[PDB]
Amino acid sequence: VAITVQGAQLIKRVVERFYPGIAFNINEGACYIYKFSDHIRRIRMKHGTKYRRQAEEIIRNISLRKERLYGIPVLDEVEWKYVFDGQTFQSYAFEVYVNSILPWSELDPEEEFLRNYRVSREMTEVEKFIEFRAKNEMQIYGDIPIKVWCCFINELSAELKHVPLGMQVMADFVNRFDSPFHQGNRDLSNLEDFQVAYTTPLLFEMCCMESILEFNIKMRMREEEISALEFGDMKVDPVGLLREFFILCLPHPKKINNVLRAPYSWFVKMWGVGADPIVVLQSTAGDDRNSKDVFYDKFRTEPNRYKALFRSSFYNESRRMNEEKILEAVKYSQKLGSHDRRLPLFEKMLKTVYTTPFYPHKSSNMILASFLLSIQTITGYGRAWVKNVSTEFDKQLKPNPSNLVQDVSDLTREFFKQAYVEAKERREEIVKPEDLYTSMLRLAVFTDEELHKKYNSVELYQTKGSRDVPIKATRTIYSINLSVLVPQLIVTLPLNEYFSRVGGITSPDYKKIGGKVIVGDLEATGSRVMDAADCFRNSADRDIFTIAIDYSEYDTHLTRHNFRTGMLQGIREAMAPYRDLRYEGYTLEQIIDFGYGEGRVANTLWNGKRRLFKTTFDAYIRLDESERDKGSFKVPKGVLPVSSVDVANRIAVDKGFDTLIAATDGSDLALIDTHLSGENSTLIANSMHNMAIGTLMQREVGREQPGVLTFLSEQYVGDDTLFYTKLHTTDTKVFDKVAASIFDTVAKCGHEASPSKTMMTPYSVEKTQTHAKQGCYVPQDRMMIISSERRKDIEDVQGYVRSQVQTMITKVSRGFCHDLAQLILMLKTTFIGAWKMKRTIKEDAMYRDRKFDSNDEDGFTLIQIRNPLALYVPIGWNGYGAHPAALNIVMTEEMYVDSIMISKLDEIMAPIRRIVHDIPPCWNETSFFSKMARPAVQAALSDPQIINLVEELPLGEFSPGRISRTMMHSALLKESSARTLLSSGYELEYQKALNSWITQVSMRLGEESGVISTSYAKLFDVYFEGELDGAPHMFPDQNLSPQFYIQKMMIGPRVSSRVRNSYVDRIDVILRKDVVMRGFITANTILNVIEKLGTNHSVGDLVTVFTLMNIETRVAEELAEYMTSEKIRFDALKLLKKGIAGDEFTMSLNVATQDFIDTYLAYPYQLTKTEVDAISLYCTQMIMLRAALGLPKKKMKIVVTDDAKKRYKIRLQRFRTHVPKIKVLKKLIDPNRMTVRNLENQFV
Amino acid sequence: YIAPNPRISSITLTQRITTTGPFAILTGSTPTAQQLNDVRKIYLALMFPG
């Protein structure tokens, strides 16, 4: 019944189907075979050295399998005809697919490429262009080949006795068509064949996702022990909601899903808002509307105050635009596919969306609301051709008295001026001429002629870039030349650091400007449920009416000059207190228009993908005889080149459209005057543009309809506004006039905010893709498991799947099934390093690198199939660990000796016990600067060489610096060659480090002297005693598996800040701020320098020791006081090694905080500050395992008896982890510390 | 040159921790190769007195 016994039979059966002649034993750590293909056999034929048997050996091992080398069997990969056992179905979706195909008739500039038919022996001017696009657009790179994904569902559908539709349309693709593509399993980036259609990998990636989405639901529906979902009155089947959706996209899935995701997201926002009894989850927090310290009460219901408000004309107009958006996506697919049926289950819900209720306390309404958010992720990573279009500023709106353009431009001048003043109070100033060159390392140049040169030329220019996104179409990224970005670095620096803090008060009548705007970081620091608690409590409040407008194509109306001049007017007038000092000869007012000049951002030439027209061939050669030029600009491989646009537009249209065309030089590609995403002021400026617009929003509402709609909060983030207001009348006519004056303010600014995008609702909040509904948490999961952003190279396979399980902690936290999230990792633990070995071996002997023989030079590489239960063997024993009973608990080596002593885990961890100390090891790979360096570095580099070299060869730790500059020089050649060149070196290392591997007995629970881990708690016993309250805590995030619902029930959501971040990580906060310190060195780096010397003779010998790290000099103050603090304050000198409590579900719980100790911990008082953390980090995993089993909630107490022999073993083992014997003569630390002097008298 | 016993300063000069002074700093320091040459200048002037 356990996941380790039932699930391991399935992943073994996948290997029993994939490599069909493999005898697999579970109790072996990893079995080894090999296989080869003749793509490399043909190559050394061409160099002269012919081979003995060309394909005779291939005949020997196809189906007889009778040959095996060195005793190691040789087994072939399965063909495509057999991955579904030759099954066939009716599959009405598949016959919709095959009539929705079209050859040689597509528009060559288009966003998401349609169904092109592959006909063999066709032309090399169209079909090579279509093969050029699909090689860039349709790529399924990642960590797992897509072939074994299709075999995995074939094995998984049999056990659940349920057939997914993604396999039904795939099983008809195997009997009529042989092989869709040839993905090489070594690199996963090459797809060199399409047999019937160019969009065949998109056909599978939307099918290998379609199958998991209904295995996720059907497993979850039995966990809630309900038959089907329940819209507010009627029964509804969730799989029919997806099968009605999968048929509609299947003509053109990247285009259909991008226009159908808008009514699906809008439906979940406005569901339970119009019903008269409304059930909320009563919350309580601070007086500010943005306070995050929230306390939850039980569920209750209340009468709706806004019942008659939804009879208005704002919602009735907004609903028919969304019912149109359903119908336009339908009519585009009713003709391109043969189907006459569409969406019959969803259309019955949108006709009455407001008045139907939604109750979160029943699970049959929370799964359905989560499912519709997770519908849209089948066609992940929309990769799209973009075209190069210009400014076209005749459409740019000129400032007028009748328009608000000049009033917007004078508002935003007073906001950059105000951000500079309020950064002066937080000690954020401009950079100085002294540290101008030192402060240039914040990015990864400066010449008086290179700074005066322009870029509005065909000869020299700027070059665009592009990077992908999860569901959206591919957004651009701007690459600016580094000569003219440093003038933007010097003047936008006290704005990047100022809005970097997380705290803020958002009141409109407050005078300050920093709290009301906020720019987050790359990763969400903390959880998502934890730091979005201000969104939850305002959907649970009867008197908050939130307004959140949306700007469609924000840059096209940021293109206007009104925010360009008004920003630069406020830059110049605020540099007036800095008007005397000169930057390298010239003033500061001259250099701001070197980063915001005319040939910098006003009018610059940009080169993207080119314009191109589809024409005939006979008229092409009659004109191309005069203009055959190249060399100025390049042309894609399908297209035929000409010189200019003016000879390319005269022959433009053709009924046959045989051959393509492209202008190389005479194009005049693109000129843009718009705030770039690449500048240092991207997220600072456009969020201030929402502030200048949003302040004009409150004025016209207050001047046309006064007394109504008072404003209480103002949150401005990237391309979003969020007003927390309250409405003072439930009127049908008056509210219709207030909602009209909001759109008239945006339209008279220049933008066009859609009435279907604008949100004016009482009981629903969306903010930065976090949906809050009626006091609870409705989650989406757009993160996916098949595709990826770029091709991923598995360099640290110990640390890759340890990082991949973090993105599987989040998935089950949004409602994915817990055990289905175990089966995915147990599949994904065997198929990672299978093709990372160079040459073949013979077992129980040496490992052959060179062969020089015709037999073994055919069997090139090996296969390494690890056991599926390598997920559960803990770290430090050459395999990564996650616990089977709960995914959020880190399996460590002290947890392995505990989890076998518990009676409720003798059945689950019975097959785990036989594979420990059985697994193979892990593929664990590991001039200008004379100006841009601190004077700690320049004095150390301009030294006499007789003094500079003694810090390099004999002595010195020196983890950052000139050799790290060489590592920074190794980081810039890293991307192609240095990753590949050392990959030839680690493989010769890994064969020796595998042949010298002996599976060693006598596991140890301990660490070195100068560090300690969570395994320190095994010195003492632990007695589960006491009794606590069995009160079920209340929490907003419903929709969890029972392995996660019971951890949040017994242990509530946290209410304070966690204390377990030790003072070793308090100085990491000092090293987190500096980006010249953040990406390079940290606490494990800086404590090794304290390991080289403690207890010096003067503090003036103390401040200077980290200038010898040659990074900074200011933060040696924080290392002056804290070492003086640890000379005053007690400390255990050791560090803390851990890998636990970092995933975003553990940060939400009330574990590892100061209020967690006071009820769940009882420890002896003779323990230091970093020893009580090692007990508490042990104590967190014990209680989370105590709750996820069903064991009774007790108070964990570590006990020290009076057994005078056992009191001696503790005083012997606490001593050696505090002070080292031999290393005292290395550090020359004094033993007269107060903490280490107590150890004589602690336990006695 | 013969140093004294290292316990003759440990029981009486650095005997009380949580206090430092002029003497308690000088005990934790070893002479360089040139300060040890100036000790040789002290002991030459004590043998040839005036």
Binding site: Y1208, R1211, L1212, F1215, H1218, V1219, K1221, I1222, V1224, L1225, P1231, N1232, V1236, R1237, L1239, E1240 | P6, R7, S10
Partner: peptide
């Protein structure tokens, strides 16, 4: 060199004599 080590529990009072193996 030539240092020896044994099973000791006195953290301060025995490592005083450990430098006597050094000197």
């Amino acid at each position: 060199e030539g240092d020896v080590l044994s099973s000791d529990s006195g953290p301060l009072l025995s490592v005083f004599a450990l430098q006597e193996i050094m000197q």
